[PDB]
Write a protein that binds this ligand. Structure first.
Ligand SMILES: CC(=O)SCCNC(=O)CCNC(=O)[C@H](O)C(C)(C)COP(=O)(O)OP(=O)(O)OC[C@H]1O[C@@H](n2cnc3c(N)ncnc32)[C@H](O)[C@@H]1OP(=O)(O)O
Ligand SMILES: CC(=O)SCCNC(=O)CCNC(=O)[C@H](O)C(C)(C)COP(=O)(O)OP(=O)(O)OC[C@H]1O[C@@H](n2cnc3c(N)ncnc32)[C@H](O)[C@@H]1OP(=O)(O)O
Lengths: 753, 751
């Protein structure tokens, strides 16, 4: 079938099949380690737990192990396809738990559509798990199953499909009512859809203060009125209204809030006209919402809008709810997830939306936190903890809350969140600038890697790409690769660009005494690399990305000739290694073969200032094959480099010469060279020659199991980066994210002066 | 209680428990999640809905085993409960991952009733590729297993029932082969009616024993046909028509005793009256029915197996389930039938009757050791073959070499490289009459060195010789409380008999390099110089230094004393132990800026070492460039590769190239298919000391791979200098490989 589907298929099938693997968190390499992990040593925890059962939480994974359980009768938007065919989404859901709350998950697909047998099978699994996440079970069975297992089991039971939308949209409505000066007891709500999510929406809205009579529920047969027989059951009567309205159009007349849990296009302009002033629209249907935010505001300008789409503001995404909720539950070793806790989550999210460089402004286009916000865990998980204890369902009290947030941050390290946060920041930047995306030029307009990355990139609003090349030939490669998301992208052929000759004049004037006269300037300016560099220089672009298809020197050279270094700056490649507790910055990985002490120092200063952009204390090591010897050669160079750097930046920890492990490992430093002023391990590593840097970062990238992003060109006046030609597509995507950042930053600085 | 306390903290420290579920694929970024979850995840779903079998292609199913228990028969603690059994189930899981690379969900079920238990497990089938029932008390377990085996279409296997049967079965085959018995005539009595017994009888009969020649006993005595007292459906399976009623009566003239019982049950009288060449399987835990020394005291002709590791012929289940399930899953089988269990038995037995060299088949080696790295490669394919032949397989394995490759991928260097080294050292010693390698450690007062030596002498790795003032070294040894080193030889250099002969030698070597006799004497008083000379003159087999001194100062007296072999160059070499492969990095320590020629020779040295471990070396000359050959190191590395290829035309040697280009074959094929390096490189030669040194140290710290070394190559005798940043575990590894280098050199010298 399609391209994206094929990618997903290969994603699941390549290497190890599936998306999860169960590994040891403790040593198990030697026979002794196994004598502790298994017999005869493993008897010790058992004996303990046998005598004091609660201690299962102390000696086993339970305190962080959640079950994602399903019979696959309501998978995503695919319906009743079976448990086995539902296994990939349950593995996926597990991944969300791990990435957002650091929770371990076993995905359990049960072959039981009978409620009775499903519950009998699951109930009895309780000793194994810290909590149960029911997922993708069709209505009305899911209601019966969750209600039953919620009490029969002494660990939390939570069907996300029912309550996620209710919780998140609950927060969104709290804030929207606050903006429009509504009080909920008077708010008239209409819910369209009778799936698993609808009932929980009405209940949560009432828990927040809305009145039942002011809420009207609809399904495929229309308004769910009291006394209806056609297509009803026990649970659809739970919120049947005694309203006179019978069609969807009639329920929404003079209405305040629309909660759409149905089908695309279901909400019509006629319906919109007859809502109350400042109508609140939740169009949560999948794959397309009941109406797009643009159509809704087109019909009625005072509207407030939320979707399940990330393309549009106010995305309600279930990922805002279950990770923090289960987190709070597990850390308090709670017996359930009750209404007090769900409400605690609702309010925590809502409050979070209502409160470095830029930040999202609270308003009609910002009603709830963004999914890639690292603070949701920090804010929500503890309020859930608090609510669990206050309700008495917690069995373990949390006393030190700061210490608790430390424990939560540890769960959210750079290997999980750095890129996520970068992307968010790009979004805060564009949003805070009236929404324009940075204009980024790609001189390699026919590069397969580049076009494929741009698909991802344009879809997620990271930049506005401009491609360079012959328009017919690039439109052709784009069609051959079947990437339709790029039919709008600007394509420019340099020689026929209107600003071409002014560009050549500029290059000429810049390099007329460096071997480039008008003839030659014209020649060079016809080259996309040069044209791109000049667009960036002249402000016709906010940044540029090249080198996907040629060696670094050739790609970087026009950048250095056109844009040049800023005062005292030095052109230098820099990469991030995204580890779990920290990230390391490596420089210079691309430009300088054999930098002097002076040059190494400046590189250090540049990397340092970048690290600071990310709110980290840079701690710098000048790497060598030597430990504090200062011997003739590389040792003296790196020692002097550290000395110079410290003189220009006396506030920073900068040390050298030292070996790499001495540098990154603080115990080694304290045990062997405690006189060193570098403490806590360095996070910035500058190399003595191009061999060491280029080789190190590439090896780490290939055989280490840590993401590394870059190289990023530092030292230059305007925004430009040269990819490693060995890059992957996902690599280019990460690169362009950070180029979008650099571009946004530099544009901001230019607009100040 | 101290071992107990250690185990407790082991479980309590860091993350509670012993397991965590991690992603095997990228899933941090927006794109990655759009593939791991909605909307991309719809694609595999839609596929599986269409063809349920594809659940094996797009999910962990084909490598996921449930270790399921209710905690009614946990280890040797009995009916202790589901929550209390959780630690051993996680543990069992760790064993699955380590011995077969199988992922496991530990499932502790709160159900003592057979019908509800079975109803809960039956319905989990879509989740797992197989079910390993564990620690469920008899007789429930019998009913449960038979039932779920019928009801479920994925393999069902209660290891407690069949493990001892299978392993001791292999053992019995071999023991009978040594003693020239045919199974048809062998008289067996098995003592104990636990979960293990019936399956023992069943497997023995499958191997050729007659039901009539087998007697079962429990606490009340012989299980005869027509006995009523305390019998049940399953104790009837092997009721004998024997006239014997006591155990002692059954064992009279018997060939085999299978003890699945209690300590002391086998007595000299019943033992005296077993047949000639009695076979004793004393597998009670914690203590055997009888110790091997006492059984041989009573009957010298006895062959003995225990469940304990202290003694030869250990019967341990860990030899069974990992390959059994491996074979099962890889053929995507619907069950584990008797045919497969037998395949396991026969393969285990054959493997024992066959690293560089191995053990001697006889009465003290009837089966492989539990930690034999050959087991998975040997057993899993025979299980698979049996699975296919018996029709329970749903996916045929076509290429057996491709399959053994895949199993090697599962049991890669990160799990077994050091293990195999240790085994190889042991077998070298063993094949050479038990002499341990003489390794001299000049830093006799180094705490890190002493701590490593504890493990080293404990594990029969070498004969250490410490250097320093005997007083101060014993003083520190007592201070650190390491009692295993009260026997170790300690030498004060100037007080050694061969001291002056050593100084003369140094003199004659360096009399024209700035050293006359006085100076020679003076230097030879230095432990580093003394150690070097000791190794040189053969008064030691090797040396390891550099724990408390910088590398240059440590390595210099070695190079001045022992020196390089012809055409050789001193070079530091490291291994990176990854999961699919190991990488070799050189030269990581000595040469600041090796020439092309030097880089070539370094390459050759690394190559020969890799070949020593049975790998095809593939060499990349690293640069900041891809096949540019520009002035500078690119040119140097291109030339280096050309020279290497000239000296070893049979090898894949290529350059100049970047590191990702080198280790990654896709990059290479995508960008530089003209190159002669195919399949990724495993030997990486660096253009300078900065790059090599920084690389191995960085990888070691932030990478998640063990890195071992540096090892000094190019020198005439076995000597290595540690990185001063080494940890103690680092020193034990280093000394392992030093022992190997030492053994090898001694062997070639005797030629
Ligand atoms: C991602 C990867 O895999 S990276 C691959 C490994 N790295 C490489 O292949 C690149 C290695 N380095 C080089 O090739 C060279 O140092 C280059 C290309 C960066 C310099 O280019 P050269 O051909 O030597 O001189 P060139 O005229 O092109 O210099 C470019 C411009 O920037 C300036 N410039 C170049 N390098 C520097 C530097 N370290 N510091 C300050 N200014 C510099 C120059 O002055 C020049 O501007 P100007 O001539 O108008 O004054
Ligand atoms: C694990 C880690 O962290 S390593 C840290 C980084 N590595 C280092 O710091 C060591 C840096 N390298 C060096 O300092 C030098 O290369 C050393 C120590 C290897 C040798 O340096 P020198 O001071 O010249 O040694 P020295 O002059 O005493 O001679 C060494 C002996 O070995 C020989 N030798 C030394 N290097 C070599 C070589 N690459 N090739 C062949 N022979 C050599 C010499 O012939 C000499 O013997 P000779 O006296 O008969 O001529």
């Amino acid at each position: 079938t399609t391209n994206f589907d094929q990618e997903a298929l290969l994603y699941h099938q390549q290497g190890k099949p599936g998306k999860i693997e169960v590994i040891s968190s403790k040593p198990c390499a030697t026979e002794k380690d196994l004598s502790l992990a298994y017999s005869p040593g493993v008897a010790a925890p058992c004996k303990a737990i046998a005598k004091d059962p609660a201690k299962v939480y102390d000696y086993t994974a339970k305190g962080n192990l959640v079950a994602v359980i399903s019979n696959g009768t309501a998978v995503l938007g695919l319906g009743n396809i079976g448990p086995a065919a539902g296994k990939p989404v349950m593995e996926g859901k597990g991944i969300l738990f791990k990435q957002f709350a650091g929770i371990d998950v076993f995905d359990i697909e049960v072959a039981a559509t009978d409620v009775d047998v499903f519950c009998n099978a699951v109930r009895v699994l309780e000793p194994t798990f810290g909590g149960i996440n029911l997922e993708d079970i069709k209505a009305p069975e899911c209601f019966e199953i969750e209600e039953r297992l919620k009490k029969e089991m002494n660990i939390p039971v939570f069907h996300d499909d029912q309550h996620g939308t209710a919780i998140v949209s609950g927060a969104a409505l709290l804030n929207a009512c606050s903006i429009t000066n509504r009080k909920m007891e008077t708010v008239r709500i209409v819910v369209n859809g009778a799936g698993a999510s609808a009932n929980s929406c009405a209940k949560i809205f009432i828990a927040l203060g809305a009145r039942r009579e002011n809420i009207i529920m609809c399904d495929s047969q229309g308004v769910i009125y009291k006394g209806r027989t056609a297509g009803m059951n026990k649970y659809k009567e739970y919120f049947a209204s005694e309203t006179e309205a019978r069609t969807l159009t009639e329920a929404l007349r003079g209405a305040d809030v629309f909660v759409g849990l149905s089908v695309a296009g279901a909400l019509t302009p006629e319906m919109l006209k007859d809502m109350a002033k400042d109508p609140i629209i939740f169009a949560m249907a999948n794959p397309e919402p009941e109406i797009t935010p643009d159509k809704a505001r087109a019909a009625r300008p005072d509207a407030i809008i939320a979707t399940g789409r990330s393309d549009y503001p106010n995305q309600v995404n279930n990922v805002l709810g279950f990770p923090s909720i289960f987190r709070g539950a597990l850390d308090t070793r709670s017996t359930q997830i009750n209404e007090e806790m769900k409400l605690a989550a609702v309010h925590a999210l809502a409050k979070l939306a209502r409160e470095g460089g830029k930040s999202f402004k609270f308003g009609r286009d910002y009603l709830i936190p963004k999914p890639f916000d690292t603070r949701v865990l920090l804010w929500v998980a503890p309020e859930v903890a608090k609510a669990a204890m206050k309700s008495g369902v917690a069995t373990r009290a949390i006393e030190d809350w700061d210490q608790y947030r430390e424990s939560l941050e540890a769960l959210q390290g750079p290997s999980k969140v750095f890129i996520r946060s970068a992307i968010n920041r790009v979004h805060q930047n564009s949003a805070a600038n009236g929404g324009e995306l940075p204009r980024i030029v790609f001189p390699e307009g026919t590069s397969t890697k580049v076009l494929k990355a741009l698909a991802t990139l344009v879809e997620e609003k990271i930049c506005q790409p401009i491609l360079l090349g012959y328009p017919e030939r690039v439109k052709e490669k784009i069609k051959a690769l079947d990437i339709p998301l790029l039919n709008d992208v600007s394509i420019v052929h340099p020689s026929s660009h209107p600003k071409y000759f002014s560009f050549v004049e500029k290059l000429y004037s810049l390099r007329q005494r460096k071997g480039i006269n008008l003839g030659e300037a014209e020649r060079l300016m016809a080259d996309p690399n040069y044209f791109a560099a000049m667009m960036v220089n002249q402000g016709e672009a906010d940044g540029m990305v090249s080198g996907s298809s040629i060696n670094y020197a050739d790609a970087v050279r026009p950048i250095l000739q056109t844009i040049g270094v800023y005062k005292e700056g030095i052109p230098a490649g820099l990469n991030f290694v995204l580890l779990e507790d920290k990230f390391l910055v490596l420089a210079d990985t691309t430009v300088n073969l054999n930098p002097t002490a002076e040059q190494c120092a400046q590189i250090a200063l540049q990397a340092a200032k970048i690290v600071e952009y990310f709110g980290i204390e840079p701690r710098v090591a000048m790497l060598s094959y030597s430990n504090f010897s200062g011997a003739e050669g590389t040792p003296r160079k790196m020692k002097k480099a550290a000395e110079i750097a410290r003189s220009l930046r006396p506030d920073l920890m900068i040390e050298g010469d030292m070996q790499a492990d001495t540098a990154v490992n603080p115990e080694i430093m304290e045990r062997l060279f405690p006189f060193s002023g570098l403490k806590g391990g360095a996070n910035v590593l500058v190399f003595p020659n191009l061999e060491s840097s280029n080789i190190a970062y590439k090896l780490i990238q290939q055989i280490g199991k840590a993401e590394v992003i870059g190289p990023f060109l530092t030292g230059v006046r305007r925004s430009a980066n040269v990819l490693q030609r060995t890059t992957t597509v996902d690599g280019i995507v990460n690169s362009v994210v950070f180029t979008a950042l650099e571009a946004q930053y530099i544009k901001e600085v230019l607009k100040s002066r």
